[PDB]
Amino acid sequence: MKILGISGGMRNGSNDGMCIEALMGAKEMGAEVEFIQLQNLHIEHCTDDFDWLLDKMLDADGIVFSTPIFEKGATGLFHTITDRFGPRMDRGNNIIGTKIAEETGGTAPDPRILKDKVISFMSVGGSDWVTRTQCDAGMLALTPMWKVIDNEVFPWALSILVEDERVARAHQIGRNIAEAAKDIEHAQYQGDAGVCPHCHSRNFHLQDGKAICCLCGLEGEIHNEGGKYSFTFPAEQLEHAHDTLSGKFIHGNDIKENTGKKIANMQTEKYKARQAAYRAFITATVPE
Numbered sequence: 644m645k646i647l648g649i650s651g652g653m654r655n656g657s658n659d660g661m662c663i664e665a666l667m668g669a670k671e672m673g674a675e676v677e678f679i680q681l682q683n684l685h686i687e688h689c690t691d692d693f694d695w696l697l698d699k700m701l702d703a704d705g706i707v708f709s710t711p712i713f714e715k716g717a718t719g720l721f722h723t724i725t726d727r728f729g730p731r732m733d734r735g736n737n738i739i740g741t742k743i744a745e746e747t748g749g750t751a752p753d754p755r756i757l758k759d760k761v762i763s764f765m766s767v768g769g770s771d772w773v774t775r776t777q778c779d780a781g782m783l784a785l786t787p788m789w790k791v792i793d794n795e796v797f798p799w800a801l802s803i804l805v806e807d808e809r810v811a812r813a814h815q816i817g818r819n820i821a822e823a824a825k826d827i828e829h830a831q832y833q834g835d836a837g838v839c840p841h842c843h844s845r846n847f848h849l850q851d852g853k854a855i856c857c858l859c860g861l862e863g864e865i866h867n868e869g870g871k872y873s874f875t876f877p878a879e880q881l882e883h884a885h886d887t888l889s890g891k892f893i894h895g896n897d898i899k900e901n902t903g904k905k906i907a908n909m910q911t912e913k914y915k916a917r918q919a920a921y922r923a924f925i926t927a928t929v930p931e
């Protein structure tokens with residue numbers, strides 16, 4: 644089993660070390676290991692080394708991703724990789740694209756794109772401003788429905804490379820991901836149970852009558868029982884969860900329906916005149 648470790652920190656930084664430490668644990672369980680340092684890659688924002696990166700990820704049976712924490716979440720580059728995953732890696736759209744290709748004599752997309760895969764994440768920050776990175780990390784796995792094994796946060800971690808018990812945790816995360824990879828079907832989540840019984844998220848969007856899991860999208864209710872929170876939802880919601888095939892097929896269907904409505908609206912006079920008033924009112928300022 645091939646484990647790919649990816650770091651988004653500085654060259655030779657703490658994220659490099661935690662990630663290489665996971666890789667060492669993985670080799671201990673018998674895996675072939677590879678390491679990619681993202682500072683060596685050129686990756687543009689969603690509007691270039693990205694295709695290469697994805698090819699590397701598609702060949703791995705499991706992935707360990709270690710990211711610095713910036714403003715409580717993953718780095719902007721981690722969010723760009725997430726942006727760029729959609730068009731390429733959505734499990735829903737790739738199932739559709741492959742069925743369509745078969746039946747219409749089209750060329751069969753990358754079979755790798757649909758293989759099951761396990762992924763673990765590590766978020767390394769220097770303080771306790773760490774409340775959003777696990778969700779950010781979960782979002783990247785959500786689009787292709789890779790099976791999350793661990794999704795770990797390390798606050799106060801500037802000196803983590805001399806904190807033996809926390810380095811030992813990353814070693815164990817490496818063990819887990821190699822073990823999970825040996826049998827991706829029977830691999831099971833090893834991380835924290837969290838609050839969302841489906842996502843394991845602890846991040847929720849709250850409004851009167853509706854608490855929403857910020858990762859899996861389940862709409863339900865948060866309960867405070869003496870300081871312990873818990874999340875409940877009605878079973879019909881499972882159909883709609885953003886990390887299930889069912890919920891993705893629905894989501895994509897609404898996208899197709901709303902995209903057709905936009906195309907049609909873009910041919911109305913209402914649209915064209917408002918747009919022309921905007922073009923006439925102002926011109927975008929650019930640098931010299």
Ligand SMILES: Cc1cc2nc3c(=O)[nH]c(=O)nc-3n(C[C@H](O)[C@H](O)[C@H](O)COP(=O)(O)O)c2cc1C
Pocket residue numbers: 651652653655656657658659711712713714715716767768769770771772773798799800
């Ligand atoms: C602009 C910036 C914002 C940061 N924001 C946070 C933060 O919100 N929470 C946090 O825990 N650490 C934060 N950090 C600390 C970085 O996570 C830390 O420097 C990183 O773990 C270093 O990893 P490396 O050694 O691999 O580069 C921030 C660092 C920078 C430079």
Ligand SMILES: O=c1cc(-c2ccc(O)c(O)c2)oc2cc(O)cc(O)c12
Pocket residue numbers: 768769770771772801
């Ligand atoms: O190393 C850290 C460095 C910084 C930081 C960010 C922007 C600056 O203009 C600056 O002068 C320092 O912010 C942090 C914020 C954190 O929560 C944890 C950290 O380790 C850091």
